[PDB]
Amino acid sequence: KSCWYEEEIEENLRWCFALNSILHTGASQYQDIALLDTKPFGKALVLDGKLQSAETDEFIYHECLVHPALLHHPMPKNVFIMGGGEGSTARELLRHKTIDKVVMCDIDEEVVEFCKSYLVVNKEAFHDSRLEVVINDAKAELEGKEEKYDVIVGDLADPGPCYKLYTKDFYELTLKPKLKKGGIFVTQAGPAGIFSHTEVFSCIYNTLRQVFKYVVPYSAHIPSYADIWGWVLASDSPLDLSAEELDIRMRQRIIEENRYLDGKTFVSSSTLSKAVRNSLNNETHVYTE
Amino acid sequence: KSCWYEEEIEENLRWCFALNSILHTGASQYQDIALLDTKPFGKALVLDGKLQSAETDEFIYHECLVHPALLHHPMPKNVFIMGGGEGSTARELLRHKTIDKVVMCDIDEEVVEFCKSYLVVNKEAFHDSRLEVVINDAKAELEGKEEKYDVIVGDLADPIEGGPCYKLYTKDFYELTLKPKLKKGGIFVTQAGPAGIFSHTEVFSCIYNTLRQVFKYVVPYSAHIPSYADIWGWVLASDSPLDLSAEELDIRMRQRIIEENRYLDGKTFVSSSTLSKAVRNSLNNETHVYTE
Amino acid sequence: KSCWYEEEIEENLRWCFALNSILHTGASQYQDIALLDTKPFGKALVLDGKLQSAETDEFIYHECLVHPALLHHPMPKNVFIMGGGEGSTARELLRHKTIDKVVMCDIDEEVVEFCKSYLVVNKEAFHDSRLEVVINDAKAELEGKEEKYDVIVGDLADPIEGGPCYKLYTKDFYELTLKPKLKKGGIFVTQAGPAGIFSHTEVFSCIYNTLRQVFKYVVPYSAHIPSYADIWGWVLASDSPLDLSAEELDIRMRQRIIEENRYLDGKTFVSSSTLSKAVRNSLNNETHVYTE
Amino acid sequence: KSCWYEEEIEENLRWCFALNSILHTGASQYQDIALLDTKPFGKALVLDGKLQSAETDEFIYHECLVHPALLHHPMPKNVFIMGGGEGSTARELLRHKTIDKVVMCDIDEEVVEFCKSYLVVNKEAFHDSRLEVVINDAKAELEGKEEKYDVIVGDLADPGPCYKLYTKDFYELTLKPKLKKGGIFVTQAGPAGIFSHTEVFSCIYNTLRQVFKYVVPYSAHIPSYADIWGWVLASDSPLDLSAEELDIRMRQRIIEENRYLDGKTFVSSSTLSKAVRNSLNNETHVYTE
Numbered sequence A, D: 001k002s003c004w005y006e007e008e009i010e011e012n013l014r015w016c017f018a019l020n021s022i023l024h025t026g027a028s029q030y031q032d033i034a035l036l037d038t039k040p041f042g043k044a045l046v047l048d049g050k051l052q053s054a055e056t057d058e059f060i061y062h063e064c065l066v067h068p069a070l071l072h073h074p075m076p077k078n079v080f081i082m083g084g085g086e087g088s089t090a091r092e093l094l095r096h097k098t099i100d101k102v103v104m105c106d107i108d109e110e111v112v113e114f115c116k117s118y119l120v121v122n123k124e125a126f127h128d129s130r131l132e133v134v135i136n137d138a139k140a141e142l143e144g145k146e147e148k149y150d151v152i153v154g155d156l157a158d159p160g161p162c163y164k165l166y167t168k169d170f171y172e173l174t175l176k177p178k179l180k181k182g183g184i185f186v187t188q189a190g191p192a193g194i195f196s197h198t199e200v201f202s203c204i205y206n207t208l209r210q211v212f213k214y215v216v217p218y219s220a221h222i223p224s225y226a227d228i229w230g231w232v233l234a235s236d237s238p239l240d241l242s243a244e245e246l247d248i249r250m251r252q253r254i255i256e257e258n259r260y261l262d263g264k265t266f267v268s269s270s271t272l273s274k275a276v277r278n279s280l281n282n283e284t285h286v287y288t289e
Numbered sequence B, C: 001k002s003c004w005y006e007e008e009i010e011e012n013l014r015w016c017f018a019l020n021s022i023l024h025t026g027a028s029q030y031q032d033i034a035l036l037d038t039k040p041f042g043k044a045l046v047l048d049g050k051l052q053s054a055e056t057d058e059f060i061y062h063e064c065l066v067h068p069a070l071l072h073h074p075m076p077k078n079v080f081i082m083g084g085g086e087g088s089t090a091r092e093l094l095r096h097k098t099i100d101k102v103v104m105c106d107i108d109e110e111v112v113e114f115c116k117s118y119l120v121v122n123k124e125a126f127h128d129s130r131l132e133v134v135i136n137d138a139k140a141e142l143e144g145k146e147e148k149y150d151v152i153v154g155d156l157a158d159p160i161e162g163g164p165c166y167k168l169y170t171k172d173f174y175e176l177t178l179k180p181k182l183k184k185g186g187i188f189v190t191q192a193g194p195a196g197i198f199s200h201t202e203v204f205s206c207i208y209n210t211l212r213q214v215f216k217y218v219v220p221y222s223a224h225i226p227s228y229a230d231i232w233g234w235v236l237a238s239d240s241p242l243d244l245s246a247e248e249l250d251i252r253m254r255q256r257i258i259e260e261n262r263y264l265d266g267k268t269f270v271s272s273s274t275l276s277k278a279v280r281n282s283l284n285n286e287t288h289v290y291t292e
């Protein structure tokens, strides 16, 4: 093939996808923005030369990020998203019949507008009257308003400006005070591969373990991310549902059928491998400020 | 970083690993053979420009290929490997104290000799008195003798590649050649290609369904292998049940296997054998059957 | 720089250009067609993944292909192009005030239509009343009519590619089809592939020698084209002499050609037609002749 | 093909060669050193990830760099090389029957030793009793000795530490005073492509034009350099021989047959194209210090 997009996944490892075209470009003062039409992954959002989202598999990431947290809550009505600029996190949240308010808080207005314009999958989500888009830093937004939430979703970049939103101090003193009683936090937690998980996933898991009584790490392969990806659920109430109860709740509470996630899938995703489980156990690093 | 090993996973997707050196080569009329020293994955065995084995993570593939089958068997004593020329399958098998004999049947004597010399991780395994190496087509080998086995392991190229391996994935091969050479309680396991959300339809689903036509109990399972750049799959098949708990698997590992596994415990296997919604449904609905 | 156009010059040598965009595409059953906006070379026309023309330097190829032949002719009035679908050959021809008619005979109407629309450098040329476009095989076209030409230009793919073009480089084609359709003093010129110190042996030397079997005077010449990543070659052939000085060439350019050439003056042509020791000797000793 | 060496020729242009192996490695305090076995170009010397010399075509570069200068001199006996660490410049000079002394002056002793060990083509040259290897900066070496030379050869990197060895002041006040009467200077002068020639070739030519009465620029394709390369001859005596006289001198003065260069080849190489000739004419930049 003639035309390629190339990305360095790590210093010694590069990934190249064949290209059909370069569909749209933009920029903010913050970042370069591109929407590529790629052969293996369809339309691909790239920010500062890093793939953010691919048409063929973003559903995996967003179903995994959103549905477990909401399904384990008895009745989640409002949710705050730290980041989520592309609109797909909000899309998945708005499928829940209990939800009456979604706040999406991201720093880069031009990315949000670019995705509102050009990510067709999220056109309905961006028009939903339950959605509010806030242009701010998530710490400042959470500190400056008294509203508390049933669910808070971390959908930022890996821990730079975002690092402070994974610290023990942030979690303990800023984030929990904005969770309602019985509330649930979930964050994306970076690569979760047999070796790649030590970069940040293990640290995020251990940091949350210091702050919340119940913490459930889980993971799933995302082809366009070139790795297993991770997430962590955290709450001061138990996070324990069977596959069967999860499936019943999905049928009762979520409009239409999920494409990736059913109850057994969640159970599998939350059963980490021997080496990963032990490594999370042994982890001593805690993010601080 | 100026030197790179490059591989086309798909015609539209390329993976590149930084290279420390190109250590050794061979070739037979079957395939070219290279051993590379790579930065991300350590020493890597490449056959016809496809990475076969990387030092950092080959343990995942070989533990997943070998241990579930032997642990589900009540007392596995003899094993036949179709392929496995690198030696790593035999190495994992030979960790089982129950085992009395492993036969490794590979078509390419040059691959075996290269790996016996160059893959030092497998030197013990290759010199174990329990190991017999046979250079033959596995179908011909199995048909030619009446010896039966407790476990038969498929460690061959994917059937998509369509050369001499393809016949070793067909319904008739399994029914008329392989099953007659399994003992009472015998278990077959084969590697079964990519098992990704989309990639699983190329061969994993087809291998599953073909086995479903021959054996009563068929358990597909999968695990990520970083150096393969995908989820990989395997399928257990048997006429006796394959339904052990995580804890019972752990008990058997502790009793039967020399040293601790690096990748696989019982819970890992249960997780591996719980496929995602879409993959489960895709396997359930598969109608392709491999035939000659 | 994340987006790249990549081309295998040789199976062992790859060239990569940073990409601004992928502007347009077509396809016929002959070949895929793409127009790319590249950083190093500007807009580039790619046919079946081989760069054909780049905006920054296509003037070199087309001035070298066209001007030497017409300038050596005493009064060239009509010209036949074999191939030339991009329009650039016709454009350079039409700069000559002596010219009354150019016939452009290309097999792939889709390439012509794509370029007429998308290569704006050639829009004038394509709308010139002196230009006739014919969609045909050039052998069939030439044999089918008795019209003769002052200059015939070969602007086809290399004969190595071995498809419908190959016959247009054979001894018998040149002797029995082309030479009968040249007027008194007629000059043939063809592009003749890579002309590098080593690359010249693939086709340049063979084209030279094949022409040497048919015409009395044969003048091979070459020039670097950055976007081709090599020295490129052309060969003049005629039954009348081809021996003008640099100054006489410059005089003719000033008299006959509208606007100043960007690449080619008389001294440049003399330099181009003085090949290096090894290339000269290699052409001198070539025995391969193209035949059907 | 599986294994590749990649080099960025310019910011928007990359070259990749298939590899057979990585044959030897070294380093100095100054640079990383590698000898690669490459498929298109044979054994290739790479310093700091930049290809220096390729087995298949280094003869072109070294024949072009050396033979014209010596052939235009009536009787060249001693020569000083600024750089030339690989030994190939000296190899070609030592083919001349008039030459009784070659000095090779390079800063990196470990590169010279690496090439003496591993560049088999130059084993004889490195053993020739006429060769002296000096480890020093060429300006300091030329300033600190009174010996004058018939020919001085610039075989350094493109104009960093080497930049000072292309200035008008260097040429006028350091280099000419070490040329004997009738002496000739030649330097490599970087890429000489239709557009690439403006980077340095045109500046080197113009700077020499300020200092010497007679200056002859010339160029030739080197496949492994990915471009036309350039050289400049300079003298205070005429540089004008016919192809025929050059060929006669080559037969009389050089042991064995040249592989690349004959008289007509030189004449061709010194006849630059219209655009390059005019651009050298128009060049105003002069390197100073």
Ligand SMILES: [Mg+2]
Binding pocket: A052, A155, A156, A157
């Ligand atoms: Mg993201």
Ligand SMILES: [Mg+2]
Binding pocket: B009, B050, B051, B228
């Ligand atoms: Mg593979």
Ligand SMILES: [Mg+2]
Binding pocket: C009, C050, C051, C228
């Ligand atoms: Mg080409």
Ligand SMILES: [Mg+2]
Binding pocket: D052, D155, D156, D157
């Ligand atoms: Mg050099």
